[PDB]
């Protein structure tokens, strides 16, 4: 029943009455009570909010500092901080869950977060409360990463403590300061691809449903880690892939251009050098295509991209997959006696040459341009194409209804009329392309209406809209490019898992402080120098 999971304790907390809760627990009220009720479940489509089964989870979710303090410091039955809730979440996991993008929410779920870390350390100095994972198997960092709590993420990633005793559970270790000049280290415990899910991996592969996904990367340690790796060991590899892809596309273009024209496929193997070069090019192209197909399948399986919106987060992958599909079908038809393979080959060639834009993410400026092109091929061009297609189809139907051809004679075809109005769109529309009509006024009025509505009205309408788009989303294109580079580098570093791993590591192992157990801290830090002329303390 619904009224069995709850107790007087959680409600007494809900009123935020410290006296009431302490009196209730004075007699020895249980603290392990779990609110396993559907009203408290995480489902956002139903009333209520999840705050954790343990009442301490509720209080931490609330701003009741006194309640958490007393419950953790009570002489009898101090509820264990390290508790897996029904969904496997700890009070920290619940905290990050409750966190939002709201500033006051950020303040609450940051101050309370640090406080509870300190307190749990005090009760259990040697307890890895920030490492426990839920049923989904995410640490609180991994939770804020997979959810996108930019405030909690930043708080964890820049976490600093001045108390010498408890500074161990601290993220940023300031080293020294000689004038404004002062270095800054970090931890990178799981930032690097050295764990089951690395927050960089979590951000990179997270679908677009998660908000602020591209915006979180701006946290200085992560962004600098990205730039460092990119300039250190990936940029060269990325340029190498660019160059090999160029060689691939040039070989494919040369082979296609010299495709034999005489006789259905397949062909034969002349003794001349030209034939051998042609077959070498063709087979190299086939190999490239099959590799691209396999890679597309691998991305599909590994990521299993959000099927709801797969065109907004994997555009390039779909393009490569489609080009590979065209090449493969060219291969199947080629041997299948049929000169229709050329169609698939040509589509593949166009697709690949146009896909060369995918590599433009390695360059700051051209990358923004490619991002704009994708964004407005999926944002503005589709809408305008729909409306223009309605206009053109209606006016073509009207005109063809008007034409008779009862006698530049076979224009009755609807395809011809559509083509002629399209020429009107591209500035080659002959206002008197046909004289088999029977009402000049009607024909001319229809053509003029079409010209006014599409050529002078719509096309300029699209120009206006696209101006609005760019004006709004310049910065958005920048950020999306940044995210594209992040995915690029993550994929690259993943590619050399078997090639080697030792040199593909960022940061330096260091030992600065000590843990309360009187031992050393072997942590992979990463310095950051900063120049501040005002702090002076």
* 507 labelled ligand-binding: no
Binding residues for a second copy restricted to 11-50, rule: CB under 8 A: 14, 16, 47-49
Alpha carbon 213 to chain centroid distance? 6
Which region among 101-109, 168-176, 282-290, 423-431 touches Na ion (by CB under 5 A)?
423-431
The C-alpha angle with vertex 461 and arms to 456 and 466, in degrees rounded to 5, equals 135
- By CB under 5 A, is residue 45 in contact with Na ion? no
Least separation, in Å, of the C-beta of 456 and Na ion?
A: 12
* 427 labelled ligand-binding: yes
Q: How many residues bind to ligand A1D6W according to rule CB under 6 A?
A: 15
- By CB under 6 A, is residue 370 in contact with ligand A1D6W? yes
Which is closer to Na ion, CB of 28 or CB of 427?
427
User: Which positions from 373 to 392 touch ligand A1D6W by CB under 6 A, shown as an x/- string?
Assistant: xx------------------
Which region among 137-145, 166-174, 293-301, 426-434 touches a second copy (by CB under 8 A)?
426-434
Which region among 111-119, 274-282, 294-302, 349-357 touches a second copy (by CB under 8 A)?
349-357
Least separation, in Å, of the C-beta of 37 and a second copy?
A: 11
Binds ligand A1D6W (CB under 6 A): choice among 83, 141, 351, 399:
351
Q: Where are the alpha helices (DSSP H) in 62-188?
A: 65-73, 91-98, 103-123, 140-147, 150-157
Residue the block writes with tokens 């490569």? 320
Residue 528 structure tokens: 């950051």
Own/partner contacts of 165-172, CB < 8 Å, gap of 24 or more, are 165/516, 166/118, 166/121, 166/122, 166/516, 167/513, 168/121, 168/513, 168/514, 168/515, 168/516, 168/521, 169/117, 169/118, 169/121, 169/130, 172/221
Least separation, in Å, of the C-beta of 247 and a second copy?
A: 15
Which is closer to Na ion, CB of 406 or CB of 427?
427
- By CB under 6 A, is residue 319 in contact with ligand A1D6W? yes
Phi, psi of 363 (to 5 degrees): -110, 135
Query: In the chain, how many H helices and how many E strands?
Result: 21, 6
* 57 labelled ligand-binding: no
Is residue 48 a contact partner of residue 6, using CB atoms and an 8 Å limit? no
- By CB under 5 A, is residue 426 in contact with Na ion? no
> Could you say which of Na ion, a second copy, ligand A1D6W, none residue 358 binds, taking C-beta under 5 to 8 angstroms by partner kind?
ligand A1D6W
What 3-state DSSP class applies to 523? strand
How many residues in the chain?
Answer: 537
- By CB under 8 A, is residue 404 in contact with a second copy? yes
Binds ligand A1D6W (CB under 6 A): choice among 246, 449, 456, 497:
449
Binds ligand A1D6W (CB under 6 A): choice among 39, 70, 293, 347:
347
Least separation, in Å, of the C-beta of 154 and a second copy?
A: 25
Crossing angle, helix 235-257 and helix 341-355, to 10 degrees?
150
User: Which positions from 431 to 470 touch a second copy by CB under 8 A, shown as an x/- string?
Assistant: x------xx--x---x-xx-xxx-xxxxxxxxxxxxxxxx
Is residue 215 a contact partner of residue 150, using CB atoms and an 8 Å limit? yes
- By CB under 8 A, is residue 178 in contact with a second copy? yes
Which DSSP string do the residues of 342-390 spell out, in sequence order?
HHHHHHHHHHHHHHGGGGGGGSHHHHHHHHHHHHHHHTTHHHHHHHHHH
Binds Na ion (CB under 5 A): choice among 44, 427, 471, 534:
427
Distance (Å, rounded) from C-alpha 18 to C-alpha 210? 37
Other beta carbons within 10 Å of 512 = 14
What residues form DSSP beta bridges with 514? 520
Distance (Å, rounded) from C-alpha 403 to C-alpha 439? 9
Is residue 139 a contact partner of residue 132, using CB atoms and an 8 Å limit? yes
What 3-state DSSP class applies to 524? strand
Which is closer to ligand A1D6W, CB of 252 or CB of 358?
358
- By CB under 8 A, is residue 354 in contact with a second copy? yes
Give contact residues for Na ion (rule: CB under 5 A).
427
Binding residues for ligand A1D6W, per CB under 6 A? 316, 319, 347, 350-351, 354-355, 357-358, 370, 373-374, 446, 449, 453
Annotated binding site: 3-6, 14-15, 315-316, 354, 361, 427, 430
Q: Write out the binding residues for Na(+).
A: 427
């Amino acid at each position: 029943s619904y009224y069995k999971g709850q107790t007087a304790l959680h409600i007494a907390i809900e009123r935020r009455n410290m006296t009431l809760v302490t009196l209730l627990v004075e007699n020895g009220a249980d603290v392990q009570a779990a609110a396993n009720g559907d009203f408290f479940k995480k489902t956002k489509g139903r009333p209520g909010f999840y705050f954790g089964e343990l009442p301490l989870s509720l209080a931490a979710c609330t701003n009741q500092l006194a309640i958490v303090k007393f419950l953790l410091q009570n002489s009898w039955q101090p509820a264990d901080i390290s508790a897996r809730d029904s969904v496997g979440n700890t009070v920290l996991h619940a905290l990050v869950e409750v966190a939002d993008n709201t500033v006051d929410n950020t303040k609450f779920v940051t101050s309370m977060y640090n406080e509870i870390l300190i307190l749990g350390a005090k009760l259990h100095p040697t307890l890895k409360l920030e490492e426990i994972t839920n049923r989904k198997g995410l640490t609180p960092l991994a939770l804020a990463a997979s959810s996108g709590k930019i405030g909690v993420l930043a708080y964890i990633l820049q976490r600093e403590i001045h108390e010498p005793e408890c500074r161990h559970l601290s993220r940023k270790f300031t080293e020294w300061a000689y004038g404004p000049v002062h270095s800054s280290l970090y931890d990178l415990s799981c930032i690097d691809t050295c764990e089951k899910n690395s927050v960089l991996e979590v951000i990179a592969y997270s679908s677009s449903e998660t908000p602020n996904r591209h915006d979180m990367l701006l946290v200085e340690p992560l962004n600098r880690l990205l730039q460092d790796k990119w300039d250190r060991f990936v940029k060269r590899i990325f340029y190498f892939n660019f160059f090999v892809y160029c060689l691939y596309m040039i070989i494919f273009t040369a082979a296609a251009y010299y495709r034999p024209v005489e006789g259905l496929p397949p062909y034969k193997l002349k003794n001349t050098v030209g034939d051998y070069f042609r077959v070498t090019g063709e087979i190299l192209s086939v190999s490239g295509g099959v590799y691209f197909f396999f890679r597309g399948i691998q991305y599909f399986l590994q990521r299993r991209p959000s099927l709801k919106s797969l065109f907004v987060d994997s555009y390039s992958e779909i393009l490569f997959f489609v080009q590979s599909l065209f090449m493969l079908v060219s291969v199947v038809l080629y041997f299948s006696q049929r000169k229709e393979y050329v169609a698939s080959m040509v589509f593949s060639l166009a697709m690949g040459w146009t896909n060369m834009l995918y590599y433009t993410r390695g360059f700051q400026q051209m990358g923004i341009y490619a991002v704009m092109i994708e964004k407005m091929i999926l944002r503005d061009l589709c809408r305008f194409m729909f409306v223009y297609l309605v206009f053109l189809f209606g006016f073509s139907t009207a005109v063809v209804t008007l034409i008779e051809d009862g006698k530049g004679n076979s224009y009755n075809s609807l395809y011809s009329t559509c083509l002629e109005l399209f020429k009107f769109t591209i500035g080659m529309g002959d206002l008197e392309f046909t004289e088999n009509y029977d009402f000049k006024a009607v024909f001319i009025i229809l053509l003029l209406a079409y010209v006014i509505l599409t050529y002078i009205l719509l096309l300029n309408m699209l120009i206006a809209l696209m101006g609005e788009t760019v004006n709004k989303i310049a910065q958005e294109s920048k950020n999306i490019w940044k995210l594209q580079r992040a995915i690029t580098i993550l994929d690259t570093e993943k590619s050399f898992l078997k090639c080697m791993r030792k040199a593909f590591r960022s940061g330096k192992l260091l030992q600065v402080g000590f843990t309360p157990d009187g031992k050393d801290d072997y942590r992979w830090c990463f310095r950051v120098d900063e120049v501040n002329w005002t702090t002076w303390n």
